[PDB]
Each structure stands twice: as C-alpha cells, then as structure tokens.
Design a protein around this nucleic acid. Structure first.
Ligand SMILES: [Mg+2]
Lengths: 400, 547
DNA sequence: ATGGCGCCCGAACAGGGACTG
DNA sequence: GTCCCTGTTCGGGCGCC
C-alpha cells in the first residue's frame, strides 16, 4: 500500500560484513521462533550466499517474562547509512521508557537497500549452515527506521501531546521517552493512557541525576607520601581547572625525604589547599556540546561496586562526571556491573543530548564480547572500544 | 540427475569479464579420465558444448579421490574467482561429536555427485567455459560452489526438517548424519523417506556410502553407540625436522589435543620465529625434544569421548603446565570426558598466570557455547582467596563464571603483592631514567633519602627502558623492604599488574627481584615539577644526555 | 582448484605517553 | 610533529573436514 522511501549508503562505502558471534541455545530457539513468525507475516525473507552482507543478531529476555526480543546489532550499518532535542526532558520527575519497535513493521523498506539488512541465524554445534534472512519492512535498531516513520509518529502523538502539554515525549531509535512532573501513580495512569492511545493504530528520574565532583582528602596529619599523592592529583586536575595551583604544597617536599615522614602544613600551604577545594566546586568553563562530534565516555573501576564515568568530546572538557554504585558483596560480577553501567550512561546521554556515546571500556575485549549480551536489556547498542586504562585516572576520580 | 531447485543468481565484479587462459599439457592417464567424464556429463546435461562464440577458457586437471579409484575433476578457476562476486559463507564452523546427543538409531549417508547435481545460474555459465564444454552445474574449484551447495542443501532439507522436527540431521557438505529416537525398523523407514525426499530434488544417496551399523565414519571420527573416537594420528618420525615438517607435527598435535589430554606445542611452535622459507631446515632444540617425546607417550595410550546429555551440567576442569600452557577437559560424569583441549596463546608483552587462566576460561566458554549452546561450570586450580585478591585490586573488569577450586598442583598464585601504603623504616628510592633520541644514549639511576646515589650509563636504549632500568637498579641495591617513587606511569602500570613473565628480560629481572622482596611500595609523581627527591634524580640522569 | 574451522607467526595498522627547542 | 611501546587484525603456512 504505502510507497517506500529510496535510501542509499554514504558515498564510497559498502554495506556491513560483520561475522555472527556464537549464540546460546535459548537465544537461538527464541530467534528461530521470532523469525518464523516474521517470515510468515512478510516482515523478512530468506536469502542465500549471493548476498555478501551480514549483521550480527541475538536476543534478550527482559526481567521476569516469558517473552524474548530480537536485537540486531545494526550500528555498523548505521555508520554507513546516509544521514530540536527536548531540553526539558532531563528536568522531569519521572520518565518512562516505552518500546515502540513494533510500529516499524508496518512501513515497507526500499528494495535496493534490503540487501544491507542481512543477518544469519547460527545453529548449535553447526548442525546446519547459517540460515540467512533480510528485511522487507523498516528494521528495528536501524537509523533510518525512526526517520522514515517520523512523519507517521507525529500524527499519532499529536492528539496526546495537545491534551497533555506538560508532558515531553521524545523518540530515539525504537524507544519513546515520556517524562512528566505528575505524582508517582498518576504518572503510570498517564503512561497506560498513552499505551492505550498507541494500540488504536498498530522507570527513570532525571530530576535526581547527580554529578560526582573531584574531592581532595582531608587529614589532620600529612606525610610526604600523602602530599606527593595530593600534588600529582592537583597537577592533573589543573588541566581541567586552570585555577588549581600547587606551588606552596610542592615546596614542602623540597629535599629527599622518606615517604612516611610527617610534614606539617604551613599557613600559606593550607590556604592553597582550601582555595583549591573551592575551585573544584566551580563548573568547568568553556565546555560546549558539539552535535557534530562523538561523545566520549570513559569508565574507571574503583572497586567495591563503585564505578566512575566522564562524558566529554574534547580532552579535559567534561560535559558530565558521575559515579555509579552497586553491590558490595562477594557475589559481584564486574562484567554484569559494567554492562549495567554503560546502559545507564547511554540512557543519560539520550535523555540529555539525544545521542549515543562512544565508550572506552576498561575490560579485555574477549571478556566483554563473551558475556555482555547476557546482561543487555536496551533496544539500542552504543559503539565502544577497549582501553588498557592508566592506573591514574582511577585515582583522580577515586572517592575517600 | 540435476536438481530442479532454483539457481542462485551470481554476478561478476563490476568492470570485469570472463577468464581467458589456455590449457597446459597433461598425462595420458589424466586425459583418459577426463574424456570418460566429459562425455558422460554432456549426456546428463551437466556440461553443454560451446563454439567459437565463447571467448572464455580455463585450464583443468584431475586427482585421485579418497577411495583412490575414481578421478576427481578439478578446474583452476583461480582467475574467475578473482573477478567473481563476493559471497557470505554459510558454514559457520565444524560439527564436533561431543555435541551429539544420545539417539536410539543413527544413519550416516552421503549424497552422490554433490556439486554436479545442483544447477548453475544460466547467465553465469558463459564464464565457466573450458576446452569445448561449459558447466551447466556447480563446478569444482569455483569460489561460490561450496556456499551455493551448502545453502541449496539447506533449502532442500527444509521441508523434511519441518515435517520431522524430532529427526536430527547433521548437514556438512554432502554428508548427512541422521539420528532418531525411533526403533531400528521405524528408523529405516524414515531414512527412505529422506532418500525419496532428496531424490525428488535430484539428490541420490548411493548404498556404497550408506552406513547402517556402528562404528560410523563421520567427520574424521568413529561414532559408536555410547562413545566416539578419533581416527588414528601418526606423528612423522624423522631425524632433522624442517619448517614445513614442524607445522605438520604441531598441526596434527593440535588436532589430537581435542581428545588427548596433556598436549603441549610451545617449544615446537617457538622454533618458527624469524624464518622465511617453507622448506627450510632448523636444528631442533633440546627442550623441544623432551616436549615431543612426552606427547608421543600420550598418543600411544587409548582414549575416547562420550556424547552430550542435556539433563546433566557441563563441567570443565583446567590444569596448568609450564611455559604459560594450559590443558582442559570437559565432562559431565567423572572420568568420562566429552572432549579435551588446550590453550597456550601468549596475549600481551607482560602477564601473569591469573590473566592466562581468565583467558582460558573465556576461550572455553565461547567454545562450549558453539558446541553445546551453554556455559560449563568450572574446576579451577586457583584458591577462592587468590581470585578475590586479584579481581578486587585489578583495574580492569574481570570475571569467571561459577567455579570451584581443585587441589591439583601447580596451583595458580600471585608471586608478589605491592603495598597499598608506604613502608615505615624502609629506605625511599627516587628513581628516574632519561634517554637521548639522536645518540640513543641514556642514564638510569636513583637517589635515596639516606644519601645514596648511583647513575648507570646505557647505550642503544629508549626513554622507557631507562625508566625500567632505574626501578631495576633500586631493587638490586635495596633491602627486603623498599619504597620506590617513579615519574613513569609506563613502568608503574606494568609492575602494578603483578606480572610473573614477560617478553622483556629486563622486566623478567625486575620480576625476579620483586619476588625476593618482602615488601615493596611503588608511588608515582609528575615529572619535571620540582617535587623532591624526584628533582634530584632527574638532574643526575639528565646530565650529559639532555639539555 | 575451492570453502569452512583450528593453531602459530609476523607484518601492518591504531592509540597513547614522553620528548625537543 | 617524531619515536616507543602495546594491542588488534590481517593473511601467509600447516592441520582437520
Ligand atoms: Mg622519568
């Protein structure tokens, strides 16, 4: 019925050719069931090896439910696909994240572009060669899917936005972010009111998001080691805050002293330290969000379930520096905690800037790729690289 | 015959055309084998005769099959494959018998004339010309033939799998392993239904390749009712091995390590460093002669695997050998191995045995997901306390799935621990190194809070090597307890990882010193900031090689 | 001659830190 | 910027089907 929108790739680039990673039996069984239902309804069609393109695929079971969701790692295709953010969303009491991914299955896809949406379903023990599919409609997790459907999305949410002007409804990928200043209880009544409004076709609290500032130790007795650790930390922090000085503190170390030697702080040195603390409270100056550049997110494992992060685009130009805490027990999973940490940081960037960050993860590449799908719960996937972090940035954002 | 299945549309790469290569001379025995095949194929419509209207050509040849009686016709489409489109391969791995579940009745049958039964795209048959015929079916030696046959076979088996979801069909090329929970007689009926289904799609199953009794020959194994074994592996008994002979030895040992536990190939593989000739001979080292001897002793002993029981849990147990090598065994019942394996990949210039154990656990986990679709419970030779010490203090996010300690030495441990706080009563060394980019000269040295000073001159060095040489110098000239302050986050990051082995002998010497010490505290200060006594050592090592 | 997977190795890359005047 | 060091991916060789 509805005509398709012709979409092509970026100039001078070919489609994705990414290998499929091993999938567990429960994920393969869920994918086979979902694909057979999608193939019956004409959403996807089988293809052969004459299609040279591939894109990974897996599935996730959300919380306590007997329903699986198919997830296609389309971020390699989005980078190759041809190319106002609500500022008031981050200031709402409650924000509910709805999944409107099913709405994309009603709009067909340009035939010349379907060859690039190919994916392969593996088998256990390689009983069968890969059985490949391609998309016939707007695929979930693709950059073009919300854009082509944007015209039809506004026509659906228009009667709801009009009758609810104090509600901010934002869309990113398959997700629909709905924020309001309503009381907890009436907010859910309105979200169900919106869910019923969407069935006529076919929990966050950003008001309490905090920043973790750089804090300096407070002691009644300082050693040469304590001052050396303070000067090095201030020397780094001065790259972000140019007002930080360390002249009076560094002169107390004049000479070749033992690390355990106790040094009494002078009046000018303790004045320098008290003035440096007030500087760290001030916000970073000259940091302006560039929408044409990527968001860089570094994460430091502080231990004991503590996780610090910084969102920025230029060196020492942090847009936000937060911390993430979790379990302090012996049954702690670093990979599970890190995967939850990247989902919180990504969700904040979508709410604040409407963009996904490029993470620099402090994890071995094989360790991450083996288990990160076991804990994923979001419909999108951010880009990431793997860092052998310095043991320094861990100490600078470390709390005491 | 020829399968009535639809052909796979194949195109060339843009701006290119068919190959035009002449034929080379061949032996009379090969010419007789080709004319006996080409005349019979031409009558079956598998190859069609052409004329001067086909400018293309491609040389051919023939070799002996695994039965050593019939001739396999191979074409050197090496020029056509360069100009043929790219395919996505559908064969994502190799099936392993440890992933087969117990079935009451098993049949292993092959398809006769695999490639030559699947039709080729009509618009592409022009480029398959050879002197004169042209291929109407899938030729051998073409880039797309394996992928097109594997996908066409899946298309053909799809109606049978849908109709029979409880009959398991392991499809690899033209070979079919068919298992069922049925009685022997009722299983034979289902096999004929499958043979009639394949024959409907032009695929024959000759009785010569229809195995009906154990042991079944499948994928290089021998499948028995309750066990499986690998076909015999003969190691090349030679006197002076070459580069090509070592790969034949290591390659067979790697294939043997899947069921033979305790296989090591470290020193054998180490001898292939720096060589640039395949037929080059190399004197075998003495540490590799012992390694090859003990490998031979394991292969003389008999061993076998079992099949997978989904009701039971997967258990993987890892042992440790020297040289950074690891062996594992996957089982469900004690001393009934489903499979064995080994891991010895050196990852990183510097590492310890806890990283290597974490890497082996990840390799086994991904390997287990391929074969069985789930993760195994582990039996690791590392104490719960040793693991808690490592992952709590290590800056990276590391994790091991559900595991249990086993008292099978050598145990995995950390050979030394850096202090968290400075050591009272320990001499404080301020180390620093500097090097000159032009002359490659450098100086490493230290300054102590007790008046000691030493500067060592170095030649043909780097700036990072002088920093490590300074730390190594402080460790050599200090007591069992020492505080070290360095301005090198490079050297700090290395030592803080607690390595016990390194590609660098300088780091290895540093590691040996750190194990002798009883307490070491390593601190970091910024360079060129007037901090003492980092300022004093900086002026000593910079004298004569900088400003 | 082709395709898959495995192991090992050494070329080429990319990313980050320290350095000269 | 250059020079060092380190980590990943790549295509050779062998092994297996
Ligand atoms: Mg230095």
């Amino acid at each position: 019925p509805i005509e398709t929108v012709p979409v092509k790739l970026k100039p001078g680039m070919d489609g994705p050719k990414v290998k499929q990673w091993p999938l567990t039996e429960e994920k393969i069984k869920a994918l086979v069931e979902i694909c057979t239902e999608m193939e019956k309804e004409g959403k996807i069609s089988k293809i052969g090896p004459e299609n040279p393109y591939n894109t990974p695929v897996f599935a996730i079971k959300k919380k306590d439910s007997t329903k699986w969701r198919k997830l296609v790692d389309f971020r390699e295709l989005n980078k190759r696909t041809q190319d106002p953010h609500p500022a008031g969303l981050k200031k709402k009491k409650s924000v509910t994240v709805l999944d409107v991914g099913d709405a994309y299955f009603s709009v067909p896809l340009d035939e010349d572009f379907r060859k690039y949406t190919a994916f392969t379903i593996p088998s256990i023990n390689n009983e069968t060669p890969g059985i490949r599919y391609q998309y016939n409609v707007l695929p979930q997790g693709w950059k073009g899917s919300p854009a082509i459907f944007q015209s039809s999305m506004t026509k659906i949410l228009e009667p709801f936005r009009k009758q609810n002007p104090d509600i901010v409804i934002y869309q990113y990928m398959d997700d629909l972010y709905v924020g309001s200043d309503l009381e907890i209880g009436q907010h859910r009544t309105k979200i169900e009111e919106l869910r019923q409004h969407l069935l006529r076709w076919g929990e966050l609290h950003p008001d309490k998001w905090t920043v973790q500032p750089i804090v300096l130790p407070e002691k009644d007795s300082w050693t040469v080691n304590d001052i050396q650790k303070l000067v090095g930390k201030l020397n780094w922090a001065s790259q972000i805050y140019p007002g930080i000085k360390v002249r009076q503190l560094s002169k107390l170390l004049r000479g070749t002293k033992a690390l355990t030697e106790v040094i009494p702080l002078t009046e000018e040195a303790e004045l320098e330290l008290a003035e440096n603390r007030e500087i760290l409270k001030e916000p970073v100056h000259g940091v302006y969000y560039d929408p044409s550049k990527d968001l860089i997110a570094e994460i430091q494992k502080q231990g004991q379930g503590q996780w610090t992060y910084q969102i920025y685009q230029e060196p020492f130009k942090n847009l936000k520096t937060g911390k993430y805490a979790r379990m302090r027990g012996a049954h702690t999973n670093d990979v599970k905690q890190l995967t939850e940490a990247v989902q919180k940081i990504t969700t904040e960037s979508i709410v604040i800037w409407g963009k996904t960050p490029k993470f620099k993860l402090p994890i071995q590449k094989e360790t991450w790729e083996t288990w990160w799908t076991e804990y994923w719960q979001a419909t999108w996937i951010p880009e990431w690289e793997f860092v052998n972090t310095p043991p320094l940035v861990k100490l600078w954002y470390q709390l005491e | 015959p020829i399968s009535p299945i639809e052909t796979v549309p194949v195109k060339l790469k843009p701006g290119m055309d068919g190959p035009k290569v002449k034929q080379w001379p061949l032996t009379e025995e090969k010419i007789k084998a080709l004319v006996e095949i080409c005349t019979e194929m031409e009558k079956e419509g598998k190859i069609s005769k052409i004329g001067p209207e086909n400018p293309y050509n491609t040389p051919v040849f023939a070799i002996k099959k695994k039965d050593s009686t019939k001739w396999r016709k191979l074409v050197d489409f090496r020029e056509l494959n360069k100009r043929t489109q790219d395919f996505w391969e559908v064969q994502l791995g190799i099936p392993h018998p440890a992933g087969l579940k117990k079935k009451k009745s098993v049949t292993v049958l092959d398809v006769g004339d695999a490639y030559f039964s699947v039709p080729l795209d009509e618009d592409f048959r022009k480029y398959t010309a050879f002197t004169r015929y042209q291929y109407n079916v899938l030729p051998q030696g073409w880039k797309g033939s394996p992928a097109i046959f594997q996908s066409s076979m899946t298309k053909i088996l799809e109606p049978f799998r849908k109709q029979n979801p409880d009959i398991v069909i392991y499809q690899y090329m033209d070979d079919l392993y068919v298992g069922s929970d049925l009685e022997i007689g009722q299983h034979r009926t289902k096999i004929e239904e499958l043979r009639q289904h394949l024959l409907r799609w032009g695929l024959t199953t000759p009785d010569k390749k229809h195995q009906k009794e154990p042991p079944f020959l499948w994928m290089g194994y021998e499948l028995h009712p309750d066990k499986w074994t690998v076909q015999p592996i003969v190691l090349p008994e030679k006197d002076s091995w070459t580069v090509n002979d070592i790969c034949k030895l290591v390659g067979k040992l790697n294939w043997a390590s899947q069921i033979y536990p305790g296989i090591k190939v470290r020193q054998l593989s180490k001898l292939l460093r720096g060589t640039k000739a395949l037929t080059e001979v190399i004197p075998l080292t003495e540490e590799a002669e012992l390694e090859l001897a003990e490998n031979r002793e394991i292969l003389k002993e008999p061993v076998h695997g079992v099949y997978y029981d989904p009701s039971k849990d997967l258990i993987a147990e890892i042992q440790k050998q020297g040289q950074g090598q690891w062996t594992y065994q996957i089982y469900q019942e004690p001393f009934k191995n489903l499979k064995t394996g080994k891991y010895a990949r050196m990852r990183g210039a510097h590492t310890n045995d806890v990283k290597q154990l974490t890497e082996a656990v990840q390799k086994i986990t991904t390997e287990s997901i391929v074969i069985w679709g789930k993760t195994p419970k582990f039996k690791l030779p590392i104490q719960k306390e040793t693991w808690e010490t490592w992952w709590t203090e290590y800056w990276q996010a590391t994790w091991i799935p559900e595991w249990e300690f086993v008292n099978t030495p050598p145990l995995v441990k950390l050979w030394y621990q850096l202090e968290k706080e400075p050591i009272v009563g320990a001499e404080t060394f301020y180390v620093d190194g500097a090097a000159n980019r032009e002359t490659k000269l450098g100086k490493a040295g230290y300054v102590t809070n007790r008046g000691r000073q030493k500067v060592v001159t170095l030649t043909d060095t780097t700036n990072q090597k002088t920093e490590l040489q300074a730390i190594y110098l402080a460790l050599q000239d200090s007591g069992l307890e020492v505080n070290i302050v360095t301005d090198s986050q490079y050297a700090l990051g290395i030592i803080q990882a607690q390595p016990d082995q390194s590609e660098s002998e300088l780091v290895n010497q540093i590691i040996e010193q750190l194990i002798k010490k009883e307490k070491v505290y390593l601190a970091w200060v910024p360079a060129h900031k007037g901090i003492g006594g980092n300022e004093q050592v900086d002026k000593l090592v910079s004298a004569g090689i900088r400003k």
